[PDB]
Design an enzyme around this catalytic site. Structure first.
Site, short mmCIF file in Angstrom:
data_model
loop_
_atom_site.label_atom_id
_atom_site.label_comp_id
_atom_site.label_asym_id
_atom_site.label_seq_id
_atom_site.Cartn_x
_atom_site.Cartn_y
_atom_site.Cartn_z
N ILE A 66 -12.49 13.03 16.52
CA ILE A 66 -11.48 13.37 15.50
C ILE A 66 -10.10 12.73 15.77
O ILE A 66 -9.29 13.25 16.57
CB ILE A 66 -11.34 14.91 15.33
N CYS A 230 -6.18 24.20 12.35
CA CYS A 230 -7.28 25.04 12.83
C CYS A 230 -7.42 24.59 14.27
O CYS A 230 -6.42 24.55 15.03
CB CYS A 230 -8.55 24.91 11.93
#
EC number: 3.1.3.48
Length: 300
Positions: A66, A230
């Protein structure tokens, strides 16, 4: 007429629930299409992630798969004694009229809490939405960057963070934080949603909508980014962004004919990698939007 557009959308979401000749509902089919396009994007170098791959920045990424796209990454120009790098694992996502309406970022690591605050400070952020717990399923998901309520301020030099107030609502907390740097202070509001599990959906989304609505009473506009994170800054983060964007379009009376959430999420995924991470999150965005529209119709 907006009214007709809203009814048609609601009907279209209902129709998405039925399986096709391959036994797949439209959410499953659409999600796999988005996933495939994102399995594709890094490979053809459409949106390089060179900065995130630099040897010095490897330790600043929570997940190795990511990374922030270079074209939309949030660049840090605020110098601190500890950290001068312009890098944070974060991307801008455009809103209805503001190109920096959202900053989508990962849950900071112990070593990147400094960069999180540098970002909040530079970009004049007031609102933070956190949609993971510090620990989930026995794994640490995000560094706690706020003092526990009742405790003294915490130092991540040159930043001092205070917890001034905490309010409990169904499924989330609102923390009023004071962020100080040099001779200045800024009051921040952190909305911490604790009942959305990673790579999952909550049992109901009433409280997601309640949280977004209340957050938008604290800052209704897109003039400065709201920070949404998150753990990875992709799945729950992207779902929140897509729902908030759509609600803002609704409030402006600007839902377009044949409004298309697939296209919204496909665009968001060119801005922050894998925005809306699962088929269930993809469905939840559709169902939550349909509920918003159902509720809007009740007011006419």
């Amino acid at each position: 007429e907006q009214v007709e557009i809203l009814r048609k959308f609601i009907q279209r979401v209902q129709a998405m629930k039925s399986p096709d000749h391959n036994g797949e509902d439209n959410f499953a089919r659409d999600f796999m299409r988005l996933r495939r396009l994102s399995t594709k994007y890094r490979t053809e170098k459409i949106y390089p992630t060179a900065t995130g791959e630099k040897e010095e920045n490897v330790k600043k990424n929570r997940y190795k798969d990511i990374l922030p796209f270079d074209h939309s990454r949030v660049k840090l120009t605020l110098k601190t004694p500890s950290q001068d790098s312009d890098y944070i694992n974060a991307n801008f996502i455009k809103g209805v009229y503001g190109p920096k309406a959202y900053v989508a970022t990962q849950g900071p690591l112990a070593n990147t809490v400094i960069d999180f605050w540098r970002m909040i400070w530079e970009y004049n952020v007031v609102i933070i939405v956190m949609a993971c717990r510090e620990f989930e399923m026995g794994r640490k998901k995000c560094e706690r960057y706020w003092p526990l309520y009742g405790e003294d301020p915490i130092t991540f030099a040159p930043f001092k963070i205070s917890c001034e107030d905490e309010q409990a609502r169904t499924d989330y907390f609102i923390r009023t934080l004071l962020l100080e740097f040099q001779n200045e202070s800024r009051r921040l509001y952190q909305f911490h949603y604790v009942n959305w599990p990673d790579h999952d959906v909550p049992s109901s989304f009433d409280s997601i909508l309640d949280m977004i609505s209340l957050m938008r009473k604290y800052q209704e506009h897109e003039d400065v980014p709201i920070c949404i994170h998150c753990s990875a800054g992709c799945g729950r983060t992207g779902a929140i962004c897509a729902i908030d964007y759509t609600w803002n379009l609704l409030k402006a009376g600007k839902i377009p004919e044949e409004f298309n959430v697939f296209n919204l999420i496909q665009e968001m995924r060119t801005q922050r990698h894998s925005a809306v991470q699962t088929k269930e999150q993809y469905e939840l965005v559709h169902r939550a939007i349909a509920q918003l529209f159902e509720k809007q119709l009740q007011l006419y």
